[PDB]
Design a protein around this ligand. Structure first.
Ligand SMILES: [Zn+2]
Ligand SMILES: [Zn+2]
Ligand SMILES: [Zn+2]
Length: 178
């Protein structure tokens, strides 16, 4: 197994996957690493299993169809994975915790959002459809773009949103288009 956390790339108290070489801090893994379970399989492994069990799940989908899906266990897991993939980029640090807004010439967003809030929301089963999760994720980056206007710091929102969007297309097998 790896000697660093797959998400944050640091050493520390790591839990090792039994079915691949990845390792995790407790709270870097989503969901948090389970108390017992021997063997234990990580979220990458559990997602691969879903694909292997149903190869046709990799055929193209329409985003509009994916958003209306109910958060049953497999969509729950997919959203957890997509959230994790965003945390894997170090630039997610800017969007992790609750922001605040005091900049000359800008007003804060009406509905602030941040990655740890989404994490908690997933954990407490507050989303009934994929749409709920995806809207909050997109809201994060939108609020950032709106607030930082022409400051070059806006590019952080663009960059992290691109990570989100790519992983969303991959995980939910959205139909490729030009
Ligand atoms: Zn970590
Ligand atoms: Zn694994
Ligand atoms: Zn099948």
């Amino acid at each position: 197994n790896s000697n660093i956390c797959e998400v944050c790339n640091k050493w520390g108290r790591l839990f090792c996957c039994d079915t691949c070489p990845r390792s995790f801090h407790e709270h870097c893994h989503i969901p948090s690493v389970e108390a017992n379970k021997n063997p234990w399989s990580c979220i990458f492994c559990r997602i691969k299993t879903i694909q292997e069990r149903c190869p046709e799940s990799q055929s193209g989908h329409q985003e509009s169809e994916v958003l209306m899906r109910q958060m049953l266990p497999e969509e729950q897991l997919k959203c957890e994975f997509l959230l994790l993939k965003v945390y894997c980029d170090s630039k997610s640090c800017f969007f992790a915790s609750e922001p605040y807004y005091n900049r000359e010439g800008s007003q804060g967003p009406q509905k602030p959002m941040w990655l740890n809030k989404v994490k908690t929301s997933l954990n407490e089963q507050m989303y009934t459809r994929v749409e709920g999760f995806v809207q909050d994720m997109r809201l994060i980056f939108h609020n950032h773009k709106e607030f930082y206007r022409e400051d070059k710091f806006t590019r952080l929102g663009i960059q992290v949103q691109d990570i989100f969007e790519k992983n969303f297309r991959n995980i939910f097998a959205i139909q490729e288009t030009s």
